[PDB]
Symmetry: C3
Subunit: 148 residues, 3 copies
Amino acid sequence: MKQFCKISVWLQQHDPDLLEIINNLCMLGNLSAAKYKHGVTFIYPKQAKIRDEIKKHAYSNDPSQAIKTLESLILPFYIPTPAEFTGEIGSYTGVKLEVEKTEANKVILKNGEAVLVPAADFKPFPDRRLAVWIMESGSMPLEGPPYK
Amino acid sequence: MKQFCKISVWLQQHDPDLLEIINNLCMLGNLSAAKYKHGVTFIYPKQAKIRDEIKKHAYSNDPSQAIKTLESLILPFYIPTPAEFTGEIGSYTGVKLEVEKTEANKVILKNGEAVLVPAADFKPFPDRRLAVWIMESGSMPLEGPPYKR
Amino acid sequence: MKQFCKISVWLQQHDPDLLEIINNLCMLGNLSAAKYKHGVTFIYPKQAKIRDEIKKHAYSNDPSQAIKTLESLILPFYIPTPAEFTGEIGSYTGVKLEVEKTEANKVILKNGEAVLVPAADFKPFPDRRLAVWIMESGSMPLEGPPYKRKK
C-alpha cells in the first residue's frame, strides 16, 4: 500500500514486529481514529536501541515500561506538519510537548531533544486525520507538566 | 469452514488477497453485519480481470478506483434470492440497482450487464443476514440515480 | 508474551488453530473483556482428542457442535483460583458449574469430572480480570441445570 487509511497498515510494512508488540499490549486502539479524538500522530523511533528496549520489556514479566514508552510515542492529535506542533498537545502520557526549533520538514523538541521528521512515505487518505513522524534521535518526554 | 457467520471467512477461502485489500482500505465494516443494517450482500467478481484491476489500483499511489469498485460490490442489504433483487436497494456507491432479466437462480442487472448467481458454497448461520453472489460477467453500477434510503 | 492483556495472545502461543476457529465462529467477543462483564475464564482442553473433535466439527457443514463445545469452555466470569469456583457461575451454555472437590491448585467439577488446574504460564496484566485453566481430563459440563444469570 502507498496511501493509508490506518497507521497500522504503514507499520505493518515498516516494522511488523513493533505492530505485533502494540497488538500484544492491547494498544491498537491508541493508534486508531475515534469520533471524538482530534487525531492520531505516531512517532516511529528510527534508532534500534529504543525499539529493542520496547521489545525486551514487552516480552518480560513486567511489560509496564514498554507500555509507557509506547504511550509517549502516540499522540491523540493530528499533527501533520511543523506548523501544527504547537499548543496544548502531547502523547497518551499527559506530558505537554514543547518545540525547541523548527525547520521546513523537521521539529526538535525540548525535554529529550526528539528530532522529528514526517515519514516521507506516509500519505493518509483525504478524510483521515493521521500523521506519522520518524524520530531520528533523542527521546519523547516521559515526565513533565501535562497539557490540558 | 462451510457455514459462515462472517462473509470475510468465506472470502478468506476464495481470494485472501482481496480480503487483505478490503482490510487495508478500511472497508471491513462495510462487509460486516450491524444493528442498523438491513444486511450484507457481497458480489464476488469471478473474472480475474476485475479483481486484478482492483489489486493494481489498491496498491497504487491513488487507490480511489479500488475503493469505488469495492463499494459497488458491497450491498448493505440482505438479498438471498433473485426474488429479493427488487426495490430501493444498491451498493455503498448508492446507485439503485435495476434488474433487467430474472431466472430461478440468476439475476442480470442493467447499467453494466452484471450477471449474478448465488454462491453455491455460501450458507449463512441461521441468525446472520448475509448473502454472497458471484458476478460471472459485467460490472456493478458505479454511476446512476440513487436508491432511496 | 509472559503477561497477558487478552486471552487470545496466550491461545495464539498454545493452539493458534483453535484461536482461528474461535475467530472464524464469531466467538472472539465471548473470549474478550467487556465493561459490565464479570470477567473471562477460558478452559483449555489439554488432551488433543477434545481439540481435534472441535476442529472436525468447526470445519464441517454444520459447526453447531463446535460452537456448543467452545461455549462450554468459556466462562463470562473471572475465576482465578479454586476459592472463586463457587456460586451462580457457568459457561456461555448457561449450565451451572459445580465443584466436587478443590485442592490448593486444582478444582474437580461435577457432571463430567473436569479436572482443572490454572495455567502455569498465564498471568494477566494487573487489573485484567482474565483467567485460564487447563482441563487435564474429564469434560466440561455440556448439558445440565442453568445457573441464575444477572440481568
